[PDB]
Amino acid sequence: YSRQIKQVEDDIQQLLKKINELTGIKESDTGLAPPALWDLAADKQTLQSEQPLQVARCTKIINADSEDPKYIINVKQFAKFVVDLSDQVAPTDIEEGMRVGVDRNKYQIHIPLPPKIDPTVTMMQVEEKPDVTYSDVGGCKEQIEKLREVVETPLLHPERFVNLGIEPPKGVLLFGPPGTGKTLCARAVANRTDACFIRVIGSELVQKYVGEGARMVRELFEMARTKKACLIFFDEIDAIGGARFDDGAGGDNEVQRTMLELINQLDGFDPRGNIKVLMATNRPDTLDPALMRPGRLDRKIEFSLPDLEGRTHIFKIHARSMSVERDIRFELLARLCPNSTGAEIRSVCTEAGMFAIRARRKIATEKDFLEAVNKVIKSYAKFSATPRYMTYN
Amino acid sequence: ASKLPLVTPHTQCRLKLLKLERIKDYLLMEEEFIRNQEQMKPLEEKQEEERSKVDDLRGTPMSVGTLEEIIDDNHAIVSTSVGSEHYVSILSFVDKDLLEPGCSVLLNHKVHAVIGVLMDDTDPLVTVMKVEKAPQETYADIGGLDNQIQEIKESVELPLTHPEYYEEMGIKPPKGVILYGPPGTGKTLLAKAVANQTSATFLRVVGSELIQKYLGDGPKLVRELFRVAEEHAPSIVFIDEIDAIGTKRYDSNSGGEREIQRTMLELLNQLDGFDSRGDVKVIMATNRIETLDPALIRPGRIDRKIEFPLPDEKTKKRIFQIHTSRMTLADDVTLDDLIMAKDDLSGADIKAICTEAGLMALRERRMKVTNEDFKKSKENVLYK
Amino acid sequence: MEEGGRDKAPVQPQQSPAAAPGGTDEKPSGKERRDAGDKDKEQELSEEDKQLQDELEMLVERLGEKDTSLYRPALEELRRQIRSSTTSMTSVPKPLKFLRPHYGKLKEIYENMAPGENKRFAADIISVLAMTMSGERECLKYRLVGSQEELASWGHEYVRHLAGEVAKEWQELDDAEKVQREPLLTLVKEIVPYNMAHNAEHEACDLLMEIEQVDMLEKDIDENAYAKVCLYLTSCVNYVPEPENSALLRCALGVFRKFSRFPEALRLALMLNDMELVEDIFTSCKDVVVQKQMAFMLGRHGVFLELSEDVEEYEDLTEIMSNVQLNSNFLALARELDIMEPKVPDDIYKTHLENNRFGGSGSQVDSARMNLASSFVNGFVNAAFGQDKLLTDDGNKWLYKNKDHGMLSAAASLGMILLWDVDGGLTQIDKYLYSSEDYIKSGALLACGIVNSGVRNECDPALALLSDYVLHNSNTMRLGSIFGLGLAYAGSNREDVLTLLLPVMGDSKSSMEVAGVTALACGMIAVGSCNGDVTSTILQTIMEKSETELKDTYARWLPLGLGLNHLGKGEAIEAILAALEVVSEPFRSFANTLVDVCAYAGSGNVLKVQQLLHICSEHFDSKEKEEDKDKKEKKDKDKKEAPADMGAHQGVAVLGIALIAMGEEIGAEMALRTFGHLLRYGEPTLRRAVPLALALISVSNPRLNILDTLSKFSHDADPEVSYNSIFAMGMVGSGTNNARLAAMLRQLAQYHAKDPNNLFMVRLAQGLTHLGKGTLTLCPYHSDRQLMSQVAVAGLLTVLVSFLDVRNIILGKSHYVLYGLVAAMQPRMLVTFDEELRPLPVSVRVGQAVDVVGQAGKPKTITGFQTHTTPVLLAHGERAELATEEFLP
Amino acid sequence: SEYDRGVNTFSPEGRLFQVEYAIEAIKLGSTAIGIQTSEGVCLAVEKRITSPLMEPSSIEKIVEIDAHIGCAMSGLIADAKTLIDKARVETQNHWFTYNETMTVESVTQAVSNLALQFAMSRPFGVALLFGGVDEKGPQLFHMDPSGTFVQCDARAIGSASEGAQSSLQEVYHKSMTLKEAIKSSLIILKQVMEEKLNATNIELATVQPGQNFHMFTKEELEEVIKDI
Amino acid sequence: SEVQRTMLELLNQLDGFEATKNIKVIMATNRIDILDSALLRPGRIDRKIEFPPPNEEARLDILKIHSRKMNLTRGINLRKIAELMPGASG
Ligand SMILES: Nc1ncnc2c1ncn2[C@@H]1O[C@H](COP(=O)(O)OP(=O)(O)OP(=O)(O)O)[C@@H](O)[C@H]1O
Ligand SMILES: Nc1ncnc2c1ncn2[C@@H]1O[C@H](COP(=O)(O)OP(=O)(O)OP(=O)(O)O)[C@@H](O)[C@H]1O
């Protein structure tokens, strides 16, 4: 029966592997889907892609003209010339900085004109929220509430602000200890939001050429203002601009232009309006004062290292999953690691679990947590990344 | 594909016989209905003649376009190779699922409508960055250490071979691992050994070639490096000699240490990207660890730090037995004298000594080594 | 290689047996002692399962075949002395000595005669000498003998004793893993007469081990998932005494009683309810047993406890069964109101604020049908015990503005408000019973029905208010006068008020819409094996519907009154008793596709599956039987709701490759209705597959069907990322899918998820997977939901209030004697392990742990930690008493 | 940069940050508890032993300032050694000049005067708790590395100081006897020590109006441990 | 010094990670004391070879192999010409 186990199943599962393949006769795509669903509309609704609709390639509007339409059209570089396109739409949708689907001989209007932007910024929207909440971020509760009344009630009911006649704050900086802090609560913010959440990492804005970063900042602000309200996240603004310190030969101008132009874009001359932005960095002392101006940096969320209560709370947060002999001494563990950061604490619980699974155990003990903490905080104490960065220098 | 997962019974049982009979009967009615669909409704034949009509509707050449935007309703703007973009239609059979911006698409030659998507013809640097075959001997080849071996098996090999222990632990395996120590102790080889052992896809590039001749190309380079790392498999990525990026300056770079700092901030983002990372594991190796920025070394970005000490003499004799195993040695030689022949010797040193002794024996066409071969080997190899 | 010299066993056990004429004759010392030495050497060395090439099991037999061909198949002078010491070497390595068709001659070596017993020298074996021997014997020899004549001379009684001893062998060799092979071998022998082996093994497993009554138990239930026709019937009914005789668990008696009641007989779990009255052990588990007895899957049990009002704690047992003992309503006022749920959230409608500035100008929606959706805006959110004090004013003035059907709609949506609040809800509905509009008054009568759905109150306020309207002169109060009453009195299957609504079929008035929904309401109380309901419908069908068979209002509701409630019972004679008298004309044989599967809720009947498919797949019938092929596929969505999660995989496989792949009007109109019932949690397979046919509406069909495909796509679990797609469906739904026919439909889809963002169970997977109700209200909802103007004028009678048989969502609770404990629980993923090892975890996702109520959801098997000494049921069902003590936790 | 911590740099806003770093560094030491009652003053420290090799007698924190004043130790012990030596010699020369015993406030003010003086280049990583009796009765003074000395009736310093201070707020009042105060202090010490209480796991001292500086109640404290 | 860094990535590529044999690297340079310590691990470089300035015999031989290809005259005594130059280079 045991060595004879392999005599019943094979006789039917090999036959299964025959008929499933025999049904699987719509495959080998290399640029297709199952053609019963790919070419599910392989009827005449294929021919109507040909004779009703014709090419209608892209175009670019240049200038208007008086009375009868006679607008001027760029293709991309092909030719630069003046026609009247057609008459199936009222001549009020034509504004400079727009793209119509225009033929080569008839020049049909086809569709109204959408703006053209970089595909990179379209990719740059994340449209995915990480599975982190506002509950599993503990140790920074007053930082939590300070960011709660930045990205909620403007997104929720505005009648309170209208009733008090108060415009909500716009420029908010969130900052904390290096390494532990703003990033994961930013994922929580993106989890709890509803409108778009445009990511910006500061290192990617630098380009091979000069001034392109200004162009993509303009494009991202344009596609943001297509929405009623949309969230902007900024990471590591220290590299995207420190200060204007030029001396002799030009130094780091290529990023300076980008930071100053975004400074021009945030303040003055009909701003974004209903767009909420936020930035987080690693060192705040090196930022430019003009970027530090309120109206772009109104709120100043600063996270510090938790004293004891935040440490106990994060010990609760990461360690509701591992096996223990019921009783714990998490508060004395927190007392054992006074100047310790949150990801360090999660690393401590991780290594405690690793020590438990060393030979055969299934539940870690208090001395296992001791064996975690001593070989984390006071055996890897040589680097620890803290001391030159608690001064942020 | 994706029929049903069930491996629970694996025995002579109705919990297997019942399942197999029901599924084979399900395949039976599937076969009977598909026999229905081309017997009393053959049309012409309806299997490949429809494909033939599509292929006729497909143009003979490929006016290959680049995708830059999407519109849902069976058309979009595509950019031609010459640069004059078009707002062509799509095909019903254009399989509108694997469409992505910046991708090659088969268009018509006359109306240039989106006929289909084009599979990428591989990629240049994925071939360069991917190690093809297993390098050399497995963990039996190191000898002497026997401690960091268990640790790195626990952090890397153990999650793959035993994806059960952490489940009853309810815990996450460690993510980032630094190997450090004096040079020549066996970091990039320990790298070779773990590359041999693993079955996952392996990536390797040294930090020295992370410098580049323009602005932003380094951060961009790291970006699609990790993009290739994510898009293939559960993968292990190995960077060696990271400290070079902070120590050795150059003039080929357009920007100085500033662009280096920008690359550093990008990779600090990349190790702790708030976007969903997944099952990508990270192994580092660097001798001069103190010159690195310590925020790279942090928990959450780096979980383990492993020191590689200078070998002990009882480990030295183990290396002597390991490396001189396959070679023919005469009785006149002694490893014990050569153990303390240098106070400060490395594992590269002994291999270089034995290889030089081999070539010195090859000078006189001799098959076996003698003691004077090592006695003349030591000053040639070490002493200059 | 190394062979020769050390081959002593291929020499001396090769020379002696080859000279079997020289051994048995003229050398009796050799034939006895050398065979005894071969026996006691091989039985210790070559008779344990170590490898294929054993030293005598494979090695000596290379020549040993000619040592075996004439050693003892032919001696012709056999005695007692040469059956213990001559059936001594050749009996052991015979399945590898002989070829595969040794099954016929399996008797000739070992099964001839053992030296006393098989276990005498089978004790040093693992699987081969006796276990494989018994497997082959019961698989083929006992099968062929017991096929027609079990006891001829020998192959029964010795086989009976052999089965008896191997029944203990499956545990004594190792009581860890191959104990589950005892049901394997018990099912292999006498498959159809499984009871004959089951009674043999029953008391043996009862005397086997007290703690071993659980792995064989779950192996039995896994085999009881599906089997042959009589096989599951006998297996479950013999399975029922197992958690009672040896094990004193006795709380799975309810679910086993359910599994044994409807397939086997009618009053089988009624006898088990009597047995529940017998097993008056400690009352916590008793009360938890009767927790299931009304308000989880089935009720109607209020007469079996008042035996001269003598049952101990009768008054508490009745308050539990009745669902009137607010264990989910006090829960409702205490759990989610006090944490996250306000009375007036009202946001998903108000979430439609972002999309107005995409595509240009906004506020283009100016239709009136969208106000119907506004009903659900105060309707769907008001589930789970909210309140709208004059927040139905948008519905109030609209109830004084237009749309008679909309007045009925709002007044019926009021009954969704106060679901299960029988004592407070009547006072809120009272203000409408006094309306000058028949639509508002009828909707208030339907609201009184909805409030009582699944709750048996001693004052009968549904029957007592709705009775006076059942035969009312008009229709608003006449037609809608009865729908709520069946909803109120569905599980409490009371025949007295059923007789009161019987003459509505006998009214013989023009009730083309009304008599159909009367069959819905009567079947809602009772369908299947219903004496008066079957007769009244079939006679009225001949009286009017025989001379006119035109529109689906006629014969899609009277077939629903025949057997939908008794769809669990699969004797199929209710199909015979309901169809064979009405097989007259094709539109009257149109209901035969209903009645055939109206005994086929859930089982394994792939043969009955394929006959509903192959005989009527498409056939190009050209508008005469095509709708009946639609109904057959609409009767293919069931039998797959709980196919041990197995037929769903092939079901979604065949649906993709048949209907939408290459189909017809069958696959173009109601193909996606199977997905509308198949899953209720939502997985990314169909969550992407449906919008392929939904977001691309393909309006060549009467797109309301695709809209109905979009609408019932919201069958999934309430919290999801799926909001964004159906919000993006709102983007395409602004211009396309016009407000004149779809505006109420799309918005209904988003709020289907965000009802009480919880409180959903009609999936028919109760406890772990078990059945109960969940269909008598669900099946009407999609049956009348084709595409056409049925869902607009006549659908609004029901489509708002069709399915209100939801019975909670959450389970993780405490329910102490003080009913306020906060004992530490631990949520975890659904059970994945069936037969792996003794310390198998029940689940895998062990990370997150609360101690207070949360979301049970579909794919979860919350048990909890800390070992709080909760021996009450340990089988889930949300009302564990937690009889706390200290078993050293 | 390194010029930021040159000698004397306050803050972007606020006082000197390096003395604040001494304040956070004082939590990296064994705790101490002190109670001032009219019946007497009680002090208790944790030995914080790591192995049974070294003798607990050499593990010394509590010392005698003079015959009527004692004190504990916290933070860096070698930093405490200089301050204790100077306090002893200033008390002795004050007795020499002034032929009398002083108040605890004079000693506390003197060590506060030395605390700011920068041995230079950093504040001392030590916080002391002076306790004893003088002409006005029992006295207990708390001192910090910033030098701001202050009087306290009950105090807990070192690691885990704030939880012990919270329990002191819970249990301490005015009319507690010396035995009651000692028992409460030992109770709180028991719930804040990570290891089981042993004979040499901790250390206790007391000052009475009648008796002089007590000799650490050695081998008598097992009576007040075993009873509770 | 970019020559040295190229030797870094090449030599760490050819250490077992590659699969195609029969590939080796040759380096020509001067003043070996100036190159980095990275190439100075004895396992990095298999062989290092010095080229001395030519002496009298080497100078004469190089003079011969270059004077092979001109229209000379019978009787030269290139030994004198070689010893005239004090060995500049080859
Ligand atoms: N309040 C908190 N509760 C629990 N974990 C926290 C908390 N704050 C931070 N963490 C931990 O911080 C780690 C990551 O920190 P995060 O990346 O968000 O910080 P940061 O300051 O933005 O730095 P960086 O992005 O450069 O790593 C996570 O492992 C998370 O568990
Ligand atoms: N313990 C050892 N035994 C034998 N050889 C060793 C040992 N450690 C290092 N080596 C030698 O070191 C050389 C390089 O190995 P590896 O790639 O692991 O880097 P490494 O030893 O850290 O030195 P490097 O940084 O100079 O490349 C190999 O030729 C190998 O023989």
- End-to-end separation of chain C in angstroms reads 59 Å
Decide which structural class fits the backbone of chain C: mainly alpha
Counted beta strands of chain C: 0
| Largest beta-sheet details of chain E | none
Radius of gyration of chain E: 20 Å
Instruction: Please trace the helix and strand order of chain E, writing H or E for each element.
Output: HHH
| Total helical segments of chain E | 3
* Radius of gyration of chain C over all CA atoms, rounded: 33 Å
Distinct small molecules bound, one entry per kind: adenosine-5'-triphosphate
Largest interface: A-B, 100 and 90 residues
Helix/strand-derived class of chain E?
A: mainly alpha
Strand proportion of chain E: under 5%
Q: What is the makeup of the main sheet of chain C?
A: none
Secondary structure: helix percent of chain C: 40-55%
**Which bin fits the share of residues in helices of chain E?**
25-40%
Question: What is the number of E strands of chain E?
Answer: 0
Mass-distribution shape of chain C:
elongated
Shape of chain E: elongated
Q: What proportion strand of chain C? A: under 5%
GO cellular component, one term (chain D): proteasome core complex, alpha-subunit complex
Subcellular location (chain D): Cytoplasm; Nucleus
Modified residues (Phosphothreonine) (chain D): 50
Pfam families (chain D): Proteasome (PF00227), Proteasome_A_N (PF10584)
Provide a brief overview of the structure.
This is part of a larger assembly, with chains A (393 residues), B (384 residues), C (889 residues), D (228 residues) and E (90 residues). Chain B is α/β, with parallel strands linked by helices and 384 residues long.
Considering the chains and any ligands shown, give keywords for the structure.
part of a larger assembly; 5 chains; B: 384 residues; alpha/beta; 5-stranded parallel sheet; 13 helices; extended; C: 889 residues; mainly alpha; 43 helices; elongated; binds adenosine-5'-triphosphate; ATP hydrolysis activity (chain B); intellectual disability (chain B); acetylation (chain B); deafness (chain B); 26S proteasome regulatory subunit 4 (chain B)
Verbal overview:
The structure is cut from a larger assembly and holds chains A (393 residues), B (384 residues), C (889 residues), D (228 residues) and E (90 residues). With 393 residues, chain A is of the alpha/beta class. Chain A has 13 helices and eight strands. Chain A has helices spanning 10-23, 119-124, 141-148, 159-164, 182-192, 212-225, 237-240, 253-266, 309-318, 330-336, 342-356, 366-374, 387-390; strands spanning 60-63, 71-74, 80-83, 171-175, 197-201, 231-235, 276-280, 299-302. In chain A, a hairpin with a 5-residue loop joins strand 2 (71-74) and strand 3 (80-83). In chain A, helix 6 (212-225) packs parallel to helix 8, helix 9 (309-318) packs across helix 10 and helix 11 (342-356) packs across helix 12 (366-374). By secondary structure, chain B is α/β, with parallel strands linked by helices. The radius of gyration of chain B is 30 Å and the shape is extended. Chain D is α+β, with helices and mostly antiparallel strands and 228 residues long. Chain D is 33% helix and 18% strand. Chain D has helices spanning 17-25, 77-98, 104-116, 161-171, 178-192, 221-226, and strands at residues 32-36, 41-46, 63-66, 69-71, 129-134, 137-142, 150-151, 154-157, 202-207. Chain D has a five-stranded antiparallel beta sheet with strand order 3-4-5-6-7. In chain D, strands 8-1-2-9 form a four-stranded antiparallel beta sheet. Chain D is globular, with a radius of gyration of 18 Å. The termini of chain D are far apart. Chain E is built from three helices and no strands. With 90 residues, chain E is mainly α. The chains are: A alpha/beta (393), B alpha/beta (384), C mainly alpha (889), D alpha+beta (228), E mainly alpha (90). The B-E interface holds B 131-133, 135-136, 183-184, 188-189, 192, 195, 204, 206, 208-209, 240-241, 244, 248, 250, 252, 346, 348-349, 351-352, 355, 381-382 and E 1-2, 5, 8-9, 12, 15-17, 19, 36, 38, 41-44, 46. The structure holds adenosine-5'-triphosphate (ATP) (2 copies). The site of one adenosine-5'-triphosphate (ATP) has 14 residues of chain B, from helix 6 and helix 12. The site of one adenosine-5'-triphosphate (ATP) has 17 residues of chain A, from helix 5, helix 9 and helix 11. It is classed as hydrolase. The entry lists the keywords Midnolin, 26S proteasome, complex, hydrolase. The entry is titled "The cryo-EM structure of 26S proteasome-Midnolin complex in the MA state". Chain A is 26S proteasome regulatory subunit 7. Organism of A: Homo sapiens.
